[PDB]
Symmetry: C2
Subunit: 183 residues, 2 copies
């Protein structure tokens, strides 16, 4: 009769839809319940409020996001190859999971989930400065912040299918090594 | 007994506070009314709902924002000097009006005011590609999007006083002319 993470995954997929479709405030438990084709009373027995569901959804899409970066965390990798693999994983994920990129990029810097993912964002900026430092033997935090901001806006266009992953990863790699060596 | 845009300006300044302090959902008409030191019934006779106030506030801070870009729209200016003047106006505004940058950058890409300022953002991206094109005699929309995304994230650090306007405008100018000529 549909056990564990299966009813779960259906509710979260539908929440993602409605949240990315309409945004947090204009999304309703009503509309999510219809999308999951489950009863509204049912939904509340799992989530209980719109924002609690919004945080579960945010938690889950956040996870797929960092998993997509995982290959960059591989061992023996040159700074360059970590950056390239992260850019490509990030950008490939957005391209395939545009709905979840939208929820995420929104949550980032609503305010409720603006401190889960801004702290995530900041951690990501910190990771980037270290690898930019890990390259050439604080202009570095600064290049990092500019590169992440650039990646965020470019990701938007990748999610909307206006830019190919490769074209996008290409631009971001050289912004990083040539905003670096450039001025 | 305090006539026109004076009661106005007091209510909008206080709304800006509370919205930037707490975010849209966790801001209340309650808290705004206390901040403006006006009665709550009073507030509703001008605004009538939280989001209507939020749009007035968004309208007003959006205006100061584009006014800050105005010197770049001057005549006879080289592409380079338009870009430099826009970067400096944008970044000087964020530095002085951090509360309003926060409301704005949030509204941009809530969803209610995500289509006022995303269309603003997009128009800004379009203006940037044209001047990047107006320089060297669509890699251009693409550099534009990356430069705006970079400016947004850097603006954040400028608003938080972690980066000086000049340092920030410097990095963005060369990202633009060297992500351009770089790869």
């Amino acid at each position: 009769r549909l056990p564990r993470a299966v009813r779960e995954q259906q509710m979260l997929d539908a929440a993602v839809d409605v949240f990315s479709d309409r945004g947090f405030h204009e999304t309703s438990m009503d509309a999510i319940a219809a999308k999951a084709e489950i009863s509204k009373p049912m939904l509340y027995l799992y989530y209980g409020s719109k924002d609690e569901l919004f945080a579960a959804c945010i938690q889950r899409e956040g996870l797929r996001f960092v998993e997509a970066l995982a290959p960059a965390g591989d061992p023996g990798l040159s700074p360059r190859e970590q950056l390239r693999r992260a850019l490509e994983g990030f950008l490939g994920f957005v391209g395939k999971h545009r709905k979840s990129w939208m929820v995420l990029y929104r949550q980032a810097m609503q305010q409720a989930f603006v401190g889960s993912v801004q702290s995530s964002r900041d951690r990501l900026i910190e990771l980037t400065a270290h690898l930019l430092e890990s390259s050439t033997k604080q202009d570095f935090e600064l290049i990092a912040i500019a590169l992440v901001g650039a990646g965020e806006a470019v990701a938007d266009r990748v999610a909307g299918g206006e830019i190919e992953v490769d074209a996008a990863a290409d631009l971001l790699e050289s912004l990083a090594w040539r905003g670096l060596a450039g001025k």
